Amino acid sequence: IDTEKSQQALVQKRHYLFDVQRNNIAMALEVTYRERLYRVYKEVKNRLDYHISV
Amino acid sequence: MPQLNTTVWPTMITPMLLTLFLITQLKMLNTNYHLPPSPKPMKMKNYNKPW
């Protein structure tokens, strides 16, 4: 009986795998978005700065 | 020797065959030794959780 109740406890804990997967998808998309914004900002500022430096 | 008087030989043979082949054997059949009460605490046809 104790073993079966413990098996039920693990089944209750199951959901963390899908929490992990959803966390990783959200975080990867956010990292990609912010890297893209930094890329566009850096290119624009870099060209303007080449002009100002010459 | 009274053991050689063959006139009382059935009187000595007939009850014996009842006592040796019927009554004592019916009383041994009712003398039974059950097998030990050995309780296995290891019996669980379980399986991993549904994954």
Swiss-Prot record, chain A:
Any one GO BP annotation for this protein: substantia nigra development
UniProt subcellular location: Mitochondrion; Mitochondrion inner membrane
Keyword RNA-binding: no
Keywords: Acetylation, CF(0), Hydrogen ion transport, Ion transport, Membrane, Mitochondrion, Mitochondrion inner membrane, Transit peptide, Transport
Main location: mitochondrion
Disulfide partners: none
Residue numbers carrying N6-acetyllysine: 5, 13
GO cellular component terms given for this protein: membrane; mitochondrial inner membrane; mitochondrial matrix; mitochondrion; nucleus; proton-transporting ATP synthase complex
Task performed by this protein: Subunit b, of the mitochondrial membrane ATP synthase complex (F(1)F(0) ATP synthase or Complex V) that produces ATP from ADP in the presence of a proton gradient across the membrane which is generated by electron transport complexes of the respiratory chain. ATP synthase complex consist of a soluble F(1) head domain - the catalytic core - and a membrane F(1) domain - the membrane proton channel. These two domains are linked by a central stalk rotating inside the F(1) region and a stationary peripheral stalk.
Assembly description: Component of the ATP synthase complex composed at least of ATP5F1A/subunit alpha, ATP5F1B/subunit beta, ATP5MC1/subunit c (homooctomer), MT-ATP6/subunit a, MT-ATP8/subunit 8, ATP5ME/subunit e, ATP5MF/subunit f, ATP5MG/subunit g, ATP5MK/subunit k, ATP5MJ/subunit j, ATP5F1C/subunit gamma, ATP5F1D/subunit delta, ATP5F1E/subunit epsilon, ATP5PF/subunit F6, ATP5PB/subunit b, ATP5PD/subunit d, ATP5PO/subunit OSCP.
Protein name listed in UniProt: ATP synthase peripheral stalk subunit b, mitochondrial
Interval of the full protein contained in this chain: 150 to 203 of 256
Curated annotation (Swiss-Prot), chain B:
Entry superkingdom: Eukaryota
Transmembrane segments: 8-21
Subcellular location: Mitochondrion membrane
UniProt topology in membrane: Single-pass membrane protein
Signal peptide region: none
Keywords: Acetylation, ATP synthesis, Cardiomyopathy, CF(0), Disease variant, Hydrogen ion transport, Ion transport, Membrane, Mitochondrion, Primary mitochondrial disease, Transmembrane, Transmembrane helix, Transport
Gene Ontology MF, one: proton transmembrane transporter activity
KW Mitochondrion (keyword) present: yes
Assigned GO CC terms: mitochondrial inner membrane; mitochondrion; proton-transporting ATP synthase complex
GO BP terms in the entry: proton motive force-driven ATP synthesis; proton motive force-driven mitochondrial ATP synthesis
The protein's role, per its UniProt record: Subunit 8, of the mitochondrial membrane ATP synthase complex (F(1)F(0) ATP synthase or Complex V) that produces ATP from ADP in the presence of a proton gradient across the membrane which is generated by electron transport complexes of the respiratory chain. ATP synthase complex consist of a soluble F(1) head domain - the catalytic core - and a membrane F(1) domain - the membrane proton channel. These two domains are linked by a central stalk rotating inside the F(1) region and a stationary peripheral stalk.
Family assignment from sequence similarity: Belongs to the ATPase protein 8 family.
Disease linked to the protein: Mitochondrial complex V deficiency, mitochondrial 2: A mitochondrial disorder with heterogeneous clinical manifestations including neuropathy, ataxia, hypertrophic cardiomyopathy. Hypertrophic cardiomyopathy can present with negligible to extreme hypertrophy, minimal to extensive fibrosis and myocyte disarray, absent to severe left ventricular outflow tract obstruction, and distinct septal contours/morphologies with extremely varying clinical course. Cardiomyopathy, infantile hypertrophic: An infantile form of hypertrophic cardiomyopathy, a heart disorder characterized by ventricular hypertrophy, which is usually asymmetric and often involves the interventricular septum. The symptoms include dyspnea, syncope, collapse, palpitations, and chest pain. They can be readily provoked by exercise. The disorder has inter- and intrafamilial variability ranging from benign to malignant forms with high risk of cardiac failure and sudden cardiac death.
Subunit structure: Component of the ATP synthase complex composed at least of ATP5F1A/subunit alpha, ATP5F1B/subunit beta, ATP5MC1/subunit c (homooctomer), MT-ATP6/subunit a, MT-ATP8/subunit 8, ATP5ME/subunit e, ATP5MF/subunit f, ATP5MG/subunit g, ATP5MK/subunit k, ATP5MJ/subunit j, ATP5F1C/subunit gamma, ATP5F1D/subunit delta, ATP5F1E/subunit epsilon, ATP5PF/subunit F6, ATP5PB/subunit b, ATP5PD/subunit d, ATP5PO/subunit OSCP.
Protein's UniProt name: ATP synthase F(0) complex subunit 8
Organism: Homo sapiens
Encoding gene per record: MT-ATP8
Full-sequence range covered: 1 to 51 of 68
